Structure 1
Amino acid sequence: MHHHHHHMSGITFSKNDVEIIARETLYRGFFSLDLYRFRHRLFNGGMSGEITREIFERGHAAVLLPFDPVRDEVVLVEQIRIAAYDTSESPWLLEMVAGMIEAGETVEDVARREALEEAGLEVGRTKPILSYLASPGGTSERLSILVGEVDASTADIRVHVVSREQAYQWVEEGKIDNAASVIALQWLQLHYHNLRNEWTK
């Protein structure tokens, strides 16, 4: 069909449209700094020349929003995140439960495990929220968020229990400003009414 014209044939291109020529690990410690060399299709029709990009590689994470549907409360975990220091009033952040996903593990298994270990919470039902790329211009990291049913009365890390409304107001005010928690709590603000009905049936 080479005589067929271009017009006779969401996003435009797939993995068939990129060639990763080479990968190198330039730094290996707890995390890695990798270098990708690749060429890719251009929107105008041609192929790019070879492009090189640095990629921060630290694996991928499972995240759990602990929500008590009886009490309309969320459980937050506080701990120091030194990387926040230079742009934040304090490096101690209020966050969701989270942990790295190891080979062959599922998001749900990690989320449930971490909820018990960080916050001492037994999780009942879970539902997916969303899975997102934290900052794909520079890091490969993907984080997959679930909401988990908890009894908030049963709640170096410190555990905080607050109303959903307070937690969301802290997002609005900038007092909760890490991506995983912002995404989870915005989702909860959009979905809590149906979720509470589903989980208190």
Structure 2
Amino acid sequence: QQITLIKDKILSDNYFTLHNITYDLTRKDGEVIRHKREVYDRGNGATILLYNTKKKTVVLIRQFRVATWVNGNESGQLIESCAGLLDNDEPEVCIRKEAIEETGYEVGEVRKLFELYMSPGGVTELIHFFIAEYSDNQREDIEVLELPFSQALEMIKTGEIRDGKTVLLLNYLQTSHLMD
């Protein structure tokens, strides 16, 4: 009872849900004041980085993202790590369909790194992170990119790769030395 839900108002329920939540929370002091916060909920998702130890490469994808297009990304094209919304599936089950559907690779074993909130300010979104190696034996609107891991790290510096989850995954592979 340290935090109390006063009312969850639905501002929009088109496809995803935008809420206006009113709540009361205590303090280290002893008072209980209420706030009102707009909260957008598009469900949780999963993303995975595909890497190859043989040729020191990674598989990423490129696609048009309107949300970046109307906010600084001229062509709208964004290079990201394969990902998708859970849509009622378990994280791993979902990430396997996504890998197959977006990259064409039917991956084998995968490792779960963590689950992080990507924009806890006004978005509920929690993403499940995975990594997994791929092989050429596992192989329209989405362009599949295969490139050496070192070029992808540099692309973070040049700004060619400017997607949060993707940078997270890449810098993670870097400090794992699985490519070294």
Q: Residue in 1 aligned with 2:155?
A: 170
Q: Distance in 2 between matches of 1:89 and 1:137?
A: 26
Q: CA deviation at 1:115?
A: 0.2
| 15, 19, 39: which one aligns with 1:55 | 39
Q: Do structure 1's residue 20 and structure 2's residue 10 form an aligned pair?
A: no
Q: Distance in 2 between matches of 1:148 and 1:121?
A: 11
After TM superposition, list the pairs within 5 Å mapping 1:98-177 onto structure 2: 98-103=83-88, 105-151=89-135, 156-177=141-162
Q: CA deviation at 1:69?
A: 2.0
Q: Distance in 1 between matches of 2:114 and 2:72?
A: 27
User: Is the contact between residue 78 and residue 92 of structure 1 (CA under 8 Å) also seen in structure 2?
Assistant: yes
User: Is the contact between residue 152 and residue 161 of structure 1 (CA under 8 Å) also seen in structure 2?
Assistant: no
Q: Distance in 1 between matches of 2:118 and 2:4?
A: 24
Count of residue correspondences:
178
TM-score for the superposition, normalised by structure 2: 0.91
Secondary structure at 1:90 match in 2: coil
Alignment RMSD (CA, Å): 1.7
User: Is the contact between residue 107 and residue 138 of structure 2 (CA under 8 Å) also seen in structure 1?
Assistant: no
Q: Distance in 2 between matches of 1:152 and 1:182?
A: 24
Q: CA deviation at 1:131?
A: 1.6
User: Is the contact between residue 20 and residue 37 of structure 2 (CA under 8 Å) also seen in structure 1?
Assistant: yes
Q: Distance in 2 between matches of 1:35 and 1:23?
A: 6
Secondary structure at 1:87 match in 2: coil
- Structure 1's consecutive aligned runs of 4 or more residues displaced over 6 angstroms after TM superposition are none
Q: Do structure 1's residue 183 and structure 2's residue 161 form an aligned pair?
A: no
Give the letter for the 1:186 counterpart. N
Q: CA deviation at 1:129?
A: 2.2
**Could you say which structure has the larger radius of gyration?**
1
| 4, 25, 36: which one aligns with 2:21 | 36
More helix by share: 1
Give the letter for the 1:83 counterpart. A
Superposed CA deviations along residues 62-87 of structure 1, whole A, max 9, x for unmatched, are: 11111112222110111100111221
User: Is the contact between residue 26 and residue 33 of structure 2 (CA under 8 Å) also seen in structure 1?
Assistant: no
Q: Distance in 1 between matches of 2:16 and 2:128?
A: 19
Q: Distance in 1 between matches of 2:111 and 2:21?
A: 35
Q: Between the two proteins, what is the percent identity of the paired residues?
A: 29
Secondary structure at 1:29 match in 2: coil
Q: CA deviation at 1:48?
A: 3.0
Alignment gaps of 5+ in structure 1? 1-15
Q: Residue in 2 aligned with 1:70?
A: 54
